[PDB]
Amino acid sequence: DYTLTREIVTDPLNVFMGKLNDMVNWGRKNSIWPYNFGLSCCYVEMVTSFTAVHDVARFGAEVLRASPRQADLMVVAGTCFTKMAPVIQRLYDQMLEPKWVISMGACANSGGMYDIYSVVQGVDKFIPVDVYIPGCPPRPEAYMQALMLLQESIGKERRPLSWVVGDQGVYRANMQSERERKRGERIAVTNLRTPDEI
Amino acid sequence: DFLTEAHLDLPMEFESIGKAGSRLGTALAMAVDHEINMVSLVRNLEEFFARESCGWCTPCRDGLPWSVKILRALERGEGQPGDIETLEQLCRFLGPGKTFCAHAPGAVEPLQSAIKYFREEFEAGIKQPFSNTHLINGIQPNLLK
Numbered sequence A: 001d002y003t004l005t006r007e008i009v010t011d012p013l014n015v016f017m018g019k020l021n022d023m024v025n026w027g028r029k030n031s032i033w034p035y036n037f038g039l040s041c042c043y044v045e046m047v048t049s050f051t052a053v054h055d056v057a058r059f060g061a062e063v064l065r066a067s068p069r070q071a072d073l074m075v076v077a078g079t080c081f082t083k084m085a086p087v088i089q090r091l092y093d094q095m096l097e098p099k100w101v102i103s104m105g106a107c108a109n110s111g112g113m114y115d116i117y118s119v120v121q122g123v124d125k126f127i128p129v130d131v132y133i134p135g136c137p138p139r140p141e142a143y144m145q146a147l148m149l150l151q152e153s154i155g156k157e158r159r160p161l162s163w164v165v166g167d168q169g170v171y172r173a174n175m176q177s178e179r180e181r182k183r184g185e186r187i188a189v190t191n192l193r194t195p196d197e198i
Numbered sequence B: 001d002f003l004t005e006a007h008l009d010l011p012m013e014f015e016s017i018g019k020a021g022s023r024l025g026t027a028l029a030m031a032v033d034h035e036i037n038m039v040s041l042v043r044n045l046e047e048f049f050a051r052e053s054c055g056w057c058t059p060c061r062d063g064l065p066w067s068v069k070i071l072r073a074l075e076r077g078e079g080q081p082g083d084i085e086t087l088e089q090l091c092r093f094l095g096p097g098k099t100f101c102a103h104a105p106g107a108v109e110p111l112q113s114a115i116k117y118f119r120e121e122f123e124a125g126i127k128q129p130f131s132n133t134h135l136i137n138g139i140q141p142n143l144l145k
């Protein structure tokens, strides 16, 4: 199942064009350059994931461009303040295709604990989001898990190989929800370690 | 209130027994010999007084059974620290004017007099340490000093 941006359609996928699409998806998902954009404390956890103890470079996602033109991924890591929302929208508009969005933390997801006069209640009110990370802040490995989720989403999307030939629509896979995928293992948990120890 | 052998040379009047720390009452005195444990005697008295509560007012109705349970624990050596202080506080707070009628001040007169005169028998029933709680696995208790 796929969603088309030019509706819910089926898979549009010759066998050489499928291999070319897989090669392009592999190259895109293994080379994701985030935009260096810091809103709040969630950005501290993101750049913590960039350091030696986590080494997000191992996934090939450490380049951290200062220009939106050179960046493939916008991580909204922090609160979408009302004064900063036009800035976020302009920076997202300055990014070039293909571009993906990770909303990081409760503030970027929904406004979080800041249901307040000066805060936009979630970045998905005005820009589309590919992966959401709950947490306040999410720990750096949660950001890495969301990066891997984005890689799985990229690895099965369909985009035009060229802008002069073929279908120009962007097809995104309707992936199974992580909640429903992990429900079988999560409900089966019985005992946990007592909180009196280290 | 209980009186000792030194109070036997006192005239049976309201004023004389009143200043000795007791009441003349019905003037039908009861003698307690050396073979009678004072804690068991006051337990019997408080059991009578607690079960004869009319139940109207809180201090008598809900504080006399507490004294009964404390005295029952002291009788079999199951008393815990703070029990005698609880009995003394019950005696102070069940006095005249605190309860609706005079049943409970009369109830706590022998308890306070026996604690005053025979405190060594009430202290002898305190053997176990104070334990009001049980352990809950996973929650570290707040260890008060």
Ligand code: SF4
Residues within 6 Å of the ligand: A040, A041, A042, A043, A077, A078, A079, A104, A105, A106, A107, A108, A112, A135, A136, A137, A138
């Ligand atoms: S979700 Fe929490 S940690 Fe992240 S920006 Fe908001 S307040 Fe900070």
Ligand code: SF4
Residues within 6 Å of the ligand: B052, B053, B054, B055, B056, B057, B058, B060, B061, B099, B100, B101, B102, B103, B104
């Ligand atoms: S002190 Fe008197 S009024 Fe109060 S409950 Fe006891 S018997 Fe009733």
